Enzyme design. Structure first.
Site, PDB file in Angstrom:
ATOM      1  CB  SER A 233      -0.952  -0.164   1.179  1.00  0.00           C
ATOM      2  OG  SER A 233      -2.005   0.794   1.172  1.00  0.00           O
ATOM      3  CG  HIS A 374      -5.674  -2.590   0.658  1.00  0.00           C
ATOM      4  ND1 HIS A 374      -5.023  -2.322  -0.526  1.00  0.00           N
ATOM      5  CD2 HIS A 374      -5.047  -1.852   1.605  1.00  0.00           C
ATOM      6  CE1 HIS A 374      -4.023  -1.481  -0.300  1.00  0.00           C
ATOM      7  NE2 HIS A 374      -4.023  -1.174   0.988  1.00  0.00           N
TER       8      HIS A 374
END
Ligand SMILES: [Au+]
Ligand SMILES: [Au+]
Ligand SMILES: [Ca+2]
Ligand SMILES: [Mg+2]
Ligand SMILES: [Mg+2]
Length: 397
Positions: A233, A374
Protein backbone atom coordinates in the site's frame (compact mmCIF):
# COMPACT_ATOMS: atom_id res chain seq x y z
CA UNK A 1 -11.70 4.65 -20.58
CA UNK A 2 -11.28 8.37 -21.22
CA UNK A 3 -7.54 9.00 -21.05
CA UNK A 4 -4.33 8.83 -23.07
CA UNK A 5 -0.91 7.94 -21.71
CA UNK A 6 2.43 9.59 -22.45
CA UNK A 7 4.78 7.18 -24.18
CA UNK A 8 7.83 6.22 -22.07
CA UNK A 9 9.76 5.60 -25.30
CA UNK A 10 9.21 9.12 -26.68
CA UNK A 11 11.57 11.68 -25.20
CA UNK A 12 10.49 15.08 -23.94
CA UNK A 13 11.59 16.59 -27.27
CA UNK A 14 9.67 14.11 -29.40
CA UNK A 15 12.54 11.81 -30.35
CA UNK A 16 11.89 8.09 -30.08
CA UNK A 17 14.05 6.01 -27.72
CA UNK A 18 15.37 3.08 -29.79
CA UNK A 19 18.15 1.64 -27.63
CA UNK A 20 19.00 0.74 -24.05
CA UNK A 21 21.79 3.35 -23.84
CA UNK A 22 19.48 6.22 -24.79
CA UNK A 23 16.97 4.88 -22.26
CA UNK A 24 19.50 4.74 -19.42
CA UNK A 25 21.44 7.94 -20.06
CA UNK A 26 18.79 10.32 -21.47
CA UNK A 27 15.23 9.14 -20.89
CA UNK A 28 15.55 7.80 -17.34
CA UNK A 29 16.88 11.16 -16.05
CA UNK A 30 14.06 13.00 -17.83
CA UNK A 31 11.45 10.81 -16.14
CA UNK A 32 13.12 10.87 -12.72
CA UNK A 33 13.10 14.68 -12.86
CA UNK A 34 9.41 14.81 -13.85
CA UNK A 35 8.40 12.51 -10.98
CA UNK A 36 10.56 14.49 -8.55
CA UNK A 37 9.25 17.90 -9.51
CA UNK A 38 5.58 17.06 -10.17
CA UNK A 39 4.71 14.03 -8.00
CA UNK A 40 6.94 12.99 -5.07
CA UNK A 41 9.10 16.08 -4.63
CA UNK A 42 12.86 16.26 -4.94
CA UNK A 43 15.07 13.95 -2.94
CA UNK A 44 17.51 16.64 -1.76
CA UNK A 45 20.49 14.35 -1.10
CA UNK A 46 21.34 10.67 -1.08
CA UNK A 47 23.62 9.30 1.61
CA UNK A 48 24.38 12.06 4.16
CA UNK A 49 27.92 12.47 5.31
CA UNK A 50 28.55 11.06 8.72
CA UNK A 51 26.09 8.20 8.74
CA UNK A 52 26.88 5.95 11.71
CA UNK A 53 25.79 2.31 12.13
CA UNK A 54 25.45 0.98 15.71
CA UNK A 55 24.55 -2.67 16.30
CA UNK A 56 22.56 -2.38 19.54
CA UNK A 57 21.62 -6.06 20.00
CA UNK A 58 22.76 -9.32 18.42
CA UNK A 59 21.21 -12.75 19.03
CA UNK A 60 22.71 -15.78 17.30
CA UNK A 61 19.90 -18.22 18.27
CA UNK A 62 16.70 -16.28 17.70
CA UNK A 63 13.45 -17.98 16.67
CA UNK A 64 14.40 -21.17 18.45
CA UNK A 65 17.75 -21.30 16.69
CA UNK A 66 16.52 -20.64 13.16
CA UNK A 67 17.84 -17.07 12.90
CA UNK A 68 20.43 -14.52 13.85
CA UNK A 69 18.62 -11.32 14.87
CA UNK A 70 20.40 -7.95 14.78
CA UNK A 71 19.06 -4.52 15.73
CA UNK A 72 20.92 -1.58 14.20
CA UNK A 73 20.58 2.13 14.84
CA UNK A 74 21.33 3.98 11.60
CA UNK A 75 22.13 7.55 12.70
CA UNK A 76 22.12 10.17 9.96
CA UNK A 77 25.04 12.26 11.29
CA UNK A 78 27.97 11.81 13.64
CA UNK A 79 26.62 13.94 16.50
CA UNK A 80 24.84 11.63 19.00
CA UNK A 81 21.92 14.09 18.79
CA UNK A 82 21.33 13.43 15.09
CA UNK A 83 18.12 11.74 13.88
CA UNK A 84 18.17 8.02 13.30
CA UNK A 85 16.15 4.96 12.38
CA UNK A 86 16.05 1.51 13.94
CA UNK A 87 16.61 -1.44 11.58
CA UNK A 88 15.63 -5.01 12.49
CA UNK A 89 17.34 -7.85 10.60
CA UNK A 90 16.71 -11.60 10.77
CA UNK A 91 19.25 -13.75 8.92
CA UNK A 92 18.70 -17.50 8.32
CA UNK A 93 21.22 -19.46 10.39
CA UNK A 94 21.38 -22.26 7.81
CA UNK A 95 22.93 -19.84 5.33
CA UNK A 96 25.29 -18.26 7.91
CA UNK A 97 26.45 -21.71 9.03
CA UNK A 98 27.52 -22.52 5.46
CA UNK A 99 29.59 -19.31 5.38
CA UNK A 100 27.46 -17.90 2.56
CA UNK A 101 25.90 -14.45 2.43
CA UNK A 102 22.11 -14.27 2.38
CA UNK A 103 19.99 -12.30 -0.10
CA UNK A 104 17.56 -9.93 1.59
CA UNK A 105 13.95 -8.81 1.50
CA UNK A 106 13.76 -5.22 2.75
CA UNK A 107 10.59 -3.20 3.43
CA UNK A 108 9.12 -0.67 5.81
CA UNK A 109 6.46 -1.57 8.40
CA UNK A 110 3.37 0.34 9.41
CA UNK A 111 3.32 0.18 13.19
CA UNK A 112 6.82 -0.59 14.56
CA UNK A 113 9.48 -3.27 14.32
CA UNK A 114 7.96 -5.06 17.33
CA UNK A 115 4.75 -5.63 15.33
CA UNK A 116 6.32 -7.74 12.56
CA UNK A 117 6.91 -10.75 14.88
CA UNK A 118 5.83 -11.74 18.40
CA UNK A 119 9.53 -12.17 19.33
CA UNK A 120 9.65 -10.51 22.77
CA UNK A 121 13.29 -9.44 22.37
CA UNK A 122 12.54 -6.89 19.63
CA UNK A 123 12.83 -3.35 20.96
CA UNK A 124 9.43 -1.78 21.52
CA UNK A 125 9.28 1.39 19.44
CA UNK A 126 9.05 4.51 21.61
CA UNK A 127 7.97 6.62 18.62
CA UNK A 128 4.53 7.98 17.79
CA UNK A 129 2.22 5.38 16.26
CA UNK A 130 -1.15 6.00 14.55
CA UNK A 131 -4.44 5.32 16.28
CA UNK A 132 -5.07 2.58 13.70
CA UNK A 133 -2.21 0.53 15.12
CA UNK A 134 -3.54 -2.47 17.07
CA UNK A 135 -3.05 -2.39 20.82
CA UNK A 136 -1.66 1.11 21.11
CA UNK A 137 -2.16 3.47 24.03
CA UNK A 138 -2.03 7.25 23.56
CA UNK A 139 -0.13 6.83 20.27
CA UNK A 140 2.56 4.66 21.88
CA UNK A 141 3.19 0.96 21.52
CA UNK A 142 2.24 -1.43 24.30
CA UNK A 143 3.46 -4.96 24.97
CA UNK A 144 0.16 -6.20 23.54
CA UNK A 145 1.22 -4.69 20.19
CA UNK A 146 3.96 -7.31 19.76
CA UNK A 147 3.33 -9.39 16.66
CA UNK A 148 0.20 -7.34 15.86
CA UNK A 149 1.17 -7.10 12.15
CA UNK A 150 2.76 -10.56 11.78
CA UNK A 151 0.17 -11.66 9.21
CA UNK A 152 1.90 -9.37 6.69
CA UNK A 153 5.34 -10.78 7.58
CA UNK A 154 5.89 -14.55 7.14
CA UNK A 155 9.37 -14.33 8.64
CA UNK A 156 9.84 -18.05 9.30
CA UNK A 157 8.92 -18.97 5.72
CA UNK A 158 11.12 -16.26 4.19
CA UNK A 159 14.06 -17.45 6.27
CA UNK A 160 13.44 -21.11 5.45
CA UNK A 161 13.55 -20.20 1.75
CA UNK A 162 17.03 -18.74 2.25
CA UNK A 163 16.38 -14.99 2.54
CA UNK A 164 17.09 -12.49 5.30
CA UNK A 165 14.33 -10.11 6.43
CA UNK A 166 15.12 -6.44 7.07
CA UNK A 167 12.61 -3.82 8.22
CA UNK A 168 12.30 -0.28 9.61
CA UNK A 169 9.21 1.46 11.02
CA UNK A 170 8.12 4.10 8.50
CA UNK A 171 7.45 6.55 11.34
CA UNK A 172 11.13 6.66 12.23
CA UNK A 173 11.52 8.58 8.96
CA UNK A 174 8.20 10.43 8.72
CA UNK A 175 5.28 9.85 11.11
CA UNK A 176 2.24 8.99 9.01
CA UNK A 177 0.02 11.90 10.00
CA UNK A 178 -0.86 15.07 8.08
CA UNK A 179 1.58 17.21 10.12
CA UNK A 180 4.30 14.54 10.22
CA UNK A 181 6.84 16.24 7.96
CA UNK A 182 7.57 18.80 10.69
CA UNK A 183 8.74 15.94 12.93
CA UNK A 184 10.53 14.00 10.19
CA UNK A 185 14.12 13.54 9.10
CA UNK A 186 13.16 16.03 6.34
CA UNK A 187 12.84 18.75 8.98
CA UNK A 188 16.42 18.05 10.09
CA UNK A 189 17.99 17.83 6.65
CA UNK A 190 15.67 28.87 7.17
CA UNK A 191 11.93 29.05 6.56
CA UNK A 192 9.03 26.91 7.74
CA UNK A 193 6.65 26.21 4.80
CA UNK A 194 8.01 23.57 2.46
CA UNK A 195 8.70 24.57 -1.12
CA UNK A 196 6.42 23.60 -4.01
CA UNK A 197 8.85 20.87 -5.14
CA UNK A 198 9.80 19.67 -1.65
CA UNK A 199 9.52 15.98 -0.90
CA UNK A 200 6.78 14.47 1.22
CA UNK A 201 6.40 11.30 3.25
CA UNK A 202 6.70 8.94 0.26
CA UNK A 203 10.03 10.49 -0.73
CA UNK A 204 11.30 10.40 2.87
CA UNK A 205 10.21 6.77 3.30
CA UNK A 206 11.93 5.83 0.04
CA UNK A 207 15.11 7.60 1.14
CA UNK A 208 15.12 5.59 4.36
CA UNK A 209 14.99 2.38 2.33
CA UNK A 210 18.16 3.45 0.48
CA UNK A 211 19.79 4.28 3.83
CA UNK A 212 18.91 0.78 5.04
CA UNK A 213 20.62 -0.55 1.91
CA UNK A 214 23.70 1.54 2.82
CA UNK A 215 23.74 -0.32 6.13
CA UNK A 216 23.27 -3.74 4.49
CA UNK A 217 26.37 -3.10 2.33
CA UNK A 218 28.44 -3.19 5.54
CA UNK A 219 26.86 -6.29 7.12
CA UNK A 220 29.00 -9.42 6.55
CA UNK A 221 26.01 -11.78 6.89
CA UNK A 222 24.19 -10.50 3.77
CA UNK A 223 24.70 -9.84 0.07
CA UNK A 224 23.59 -6.25 -0.51
CA UNK A 225 23.73 -6.77 -4.28
CA UNK A 226 20.75 -9.14 -3.89
CA UNK A 227 18.14 -7.02 -2.10
CA UNK A 228 14.46 -7.18 -3.00
CA UNK A 229 12.74 -3.99 -1.88
CA UNK A 230 9.04 -4.47 -1.16
CA UNK A 231 6.12 -2.63 0.34
CA UNK A 232 2.38 -2.83 0.94
CA UNK A 233 0.00 0.00 0.00
CA UNK A 234 1.48 3.42 0.93
CA UNK A 235 4.74 1.64 1.82
CA UNK A 236 4.66 0.06 -1.63
CA UNK A 237 4.44 3.52 -3.16
CA UNK A 238 7.68 4.17 -1.25
CA UNK A 239 9.21 0.87 -2.38
CA UNK A 240 8.54 1.74 -6.03
CA UNK A 241 9.99 5.26 -5.72
CA UNK A 242 13.02 3.85 -3.88
CA UNK A 243 13.64 1.15 -6.49
CA UNK A 244 13.20 3.61 -9.36
CA UNK A 245 15.59 6.19 -7.90
CA UNK A 246 18.20 3.72 -6.56
CA UNK A 247 19.27 1.16 -9.14
CA UNK A 248 21.26 -0.78 -6.56
CA UNK A 249 18.02 -2.51 -5.51
CA UNK A 250 18.05 -5.80 -7.37
CA UNK A 251 14.31 -6.49 -7.45
CA UNK A 252 11.21 -4.40 -6.66
CA UNK A 253 7.80 -5.54 -5.33
CA UNK A 254 4.66 -3.35 -5.24
CA UNK A 255 1.91 -5.03 -3.19
CA UNK A 256 -1.32 -3.13 -3.88
CA UNK A 257 0.33 0.30 -4.00
CA UNK A 258 -2.59 1.96 -5.80
CA UNK A 259 -2.82 5.70 -6.46
CA UNK A 260 0.58 7.26 -6.84
CA UNK A 261 2.14 3.82 -6.80
CA UNK A 262 1.40 1.36 -9.60
CA UNK A 263 -2.09 2.44 -10.61
CA UNK A 264 -2.54 4.79 -13.55
CA UNK A 265 -3.73 8.22 -12.41
CA UNK A 266 -5.19 9.21 -15.78
CA UNK A 267 -7.65 6.34 -15.38
CA UNK A 268 -10.18 7.95 -13.05
CA UNK A 269 -11.05 5.02 -10.81
CA UNK A 270 -11.05 4.46 -7.08
CA UNK A 271 -8.76 6.86 -5.28
CA UNK A 272 -8.03 9.99 -7.30
CA UNK A 273 -5.30 12.64 -7.07
CA UNK A 274 -7.66 15.06 -5.33
CA UNK A 275 -8.72 12.43 -2.80
CA UNK A 276 -5.19 11.29 -1.97
CA UNK A 277 -3.85 14.84 -1.57
CA UNK A 278 -6.84 16.01 0.51
CA UNK A 279 -6.69 13.09 2.97
CA UNK A 280 -2.87 12.75 2.95
CA UNK A 281 -1.50 16.24 2.24
CA UNK A 282 1.92 15.18 3.53
CA UNK A 283 2.46 12.24 1.17
CA UNK A 284 3.37 13.97 -2.13
CA UNK A 285 4.94 17.26 -3.16
CA UNK A 286 2.74 20.34 -2.95
CA UNK A 287 3.21 20.47 -6.74
CA UNK A 288 1.16 17.25 -7.11
CA UNK A 289 -1.90 19.19 -5.93
CA UNK A 290 -1.90 21.02 -9.27
CA UNK A 291 -3.36 17.80 -10.69
CA UNK A 292 -6.30 17.56 -8.27
CA UNK A 293 -9.30 17.02 -10.60
CA UNK A 294 -6.84 17.55 -13.50
CA UNK A 295 -5.14 14.19 -14.08
CA UNK A 296 -5.34 14.89 -17.83
CA UNK A 297 -2.60 17.53 -17.31
CA UNK A 298 -0.14 15.13 -15.68
CA UNK A 299 3.03 14.94 -17.84
CA UNK A 300 3.75 11.36 -16.66
CA UNK A 301 1.73 8.45 -15.40
CA UNK A 302 2.68 5.56 -13.15
CA UNK A 303 3.56 3.19 -16.02
CA UNK A 304 6.64 5.39 -16.39
CA UNK A 305 7.52 4.87 -12.73
CA UNK A 306 7.33 1.12 -13.27
CA UNK A 307 9.49 1.55 -16.38
CA UNK A 308 12.21 3.21 -14.26
CA UNK A 309 12.87 -0.20 -12.65
CA UNK A 310 13.79 -1.81 -15.99
CA UNK A 311 15.75 -3.98 -16.63
CA UNK A 312 15.63 -5.11 -13.02
CA UNK A 313 12.79 -7.49 -12.08
CA UNK A 314 9.56 -5.83 -10.98
CA UNK A 315 6.46 -7.42 -9.47
CA UNK A 316 3.15 -5.51 -9.27
CA UNK A 317 0.22 -7.21 -7.54
CA UNK A 318 -3.40 -6.45 -6.72
CA UNK A 319 -6.32 -7.70 -4.64
CA UNK A 320 -9.58 -8.53 -6.40
CA UNK A 321 -11.88 -6.57 -4.07
CA UNK A 322 -9.51 -3.60 -3.67
CA UNK A 323 -11.38 -1.21 -5.94
CA UNK A 324 -9.86 1.89 -4.27
CA UNK A 325 -6.35 0.90 -5.43
CA UNK A 326 -7.76 0.25 -8.96
CA UNK A 327 -6.47 -3.26 -9.75
CA UNK A 328 -7.18 -2.85 -13.46
CA UNK A 329 -5.23 0.41 -13.37
CA UNK A 330 -2.31 -1.38 -11.75
CA UNK A 331 -2.40 -4.06 -14.44
CA UNK A 332 -2.74 -1.55 -17.28
CA UNK A 333 0.28 0.35 -15.91
CA UNK A 334 2.30 -2.88 -16.10
CA UNK A 335 1.20 -3.38 -19.71
CA UNK A 336 2.11 0.25 -20.57
CA UNK A 337 5.57 -0.20 -18.99
CA UNK A 338 6.18 -3.50 -20.75
CA UNK A 339 7.59 -1.92 -23.96
CA UNK A 340 10.52 -0.61 -21.89
CA UNK A 341 11.12 -4.02 -20.32
CA UNK A 342 10.97 -5.52 -23.84
CA UNK A 343 13.60 -3.07 -25.03
CA UNK A 344 15.80 -4.85 -22.46
CA UNK A 345 14.81 -8.32 -23.64
CA UNK A 346 12.40 -9.02 -20.75
CA UNK A 347 8.76 -10.04 -21.01
CA UNK A 348 5.64 -8.98 -19.14
CA UNK A 349 2.19 -10.52 -18.68
CA UNK A 350 1.07 -12.53 -21.72
CA UNK A 351 -2.54 -11.44 -21.99
CA UNK A 352 -4.03 -8.05 -22.73
CA UNK A 353 -6.57 -8.37 -19.91
CA UNK A 354 -6.30 -8.87 -16.15
CA UNK A 355 -5.29 -12.51 -15.47
CA UNK A 356 -7.50 -14.87 -13.51
CA UNK A 357 -7.06 -14.87 -9.74
CA UNK A 358 -3.96 -16.59 -8.34
CA UNK A 359 -2.42 -17.08 -11.82
CA UNK A 360 0.64 -14.82 -12.00
CA UNK A 361 1.64 -13.71 -15.48
CA UNK A 362 4.96 -12.41 -16.83
CA UNK A 363 8.71 -12.95 -16.81
CA UNK A 364 10.94 -10.44 -15.05
CA UNK A 365 7.96 -8.04 -15.24
CA UNK A 366 5.25 -9.92 -13.37
CA UNK A 367 1.66 -9.35 -12.24
CA UNK A 368 -0.87 -11.23 -10.15
CA UNK A 369 -4.27 -10.55 -8.65
CA UNK A 370 -5.49 -12.57 -5.65
CA UNK A 371 -8.99 -12.90 -4.20
CA UNK A 372 -10.02 -10.80 -1.24
CA UNK A 373 -9.58 -7.31 0.18
CA UNK A 374 -6.63 -4.96 0.49
CA UNK A 375 -3.84 -6.57 2.46
CA UNK A 376 -0.70 -8.62 2.11
CA UNK A 377 -1.25 -12.33 2.48
CA UNK A 378 0.55 -15.67 2.51
CA UNK A 379 -0.52 -16.14 -1.10
CA UNK A 380 1.11 -12.86 -2.12
CA UNK A 381 4.36 -13.87 -0.37
CA UNK A 382 4.34 -17.36 -1.87
CA UNK A 383 4.32 -15.78 -5.31
CA UNK A 384 6.98 -13.20 -4.35
CA UNK A 385 9.31 -15.95 -3.09
CA UNK A 386 8.96 -17.89 -6.34
CA UNK A 387 9.74 -14.71 -8.30
CA UNK A 388 12.81 -13.95 -6.20
CA UNK A 389 14.05 -17.53 -6.62
CA UNK A 390 13.79 -17.16 -10.39
CA UNK A 391 14.74 -13.55 -11.05
CA UNK A 392 16.81 -12.18 -8.18
CA UNK A 393 20.45 -11.70 -9.09
CA UNK A 394 22.45 -14.85 -8.43
CA UNK A 395 25.21 -15.23 -5.89
CA UNK A 396 27.21 -16.24 -9.22
CA UNK A 397 28.56 -15.13 -12.39
AU1 LIG B 1 -1.98 9.12 -7.62
AU1 LIG C 1 -5.16 8.52 -8.43
CA1 LIG D 1 -7.18 5.61 -9.03
MG1 LIG E 1 14.27 -18.06 20.68
MG1 LIG F 1 28.94 -4.57 -5.29
Amino acid sequence: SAYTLPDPLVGADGTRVHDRATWQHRRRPELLQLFAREVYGRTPLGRPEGMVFKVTTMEHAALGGAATRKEVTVRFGRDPNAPSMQLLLYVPNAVIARAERAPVFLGLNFYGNHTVHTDPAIALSARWIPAEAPNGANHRATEAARGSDAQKWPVEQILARGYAVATVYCGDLCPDRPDGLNASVASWLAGDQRAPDAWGAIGVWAWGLSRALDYLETDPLVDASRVAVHGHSRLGKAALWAGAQDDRFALVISNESGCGGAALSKRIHGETVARINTVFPHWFARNFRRYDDHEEALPVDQHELLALVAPRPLYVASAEDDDWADPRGEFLAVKAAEPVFRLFGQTGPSGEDVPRVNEPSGGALRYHIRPGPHGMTAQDWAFYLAFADEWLKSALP
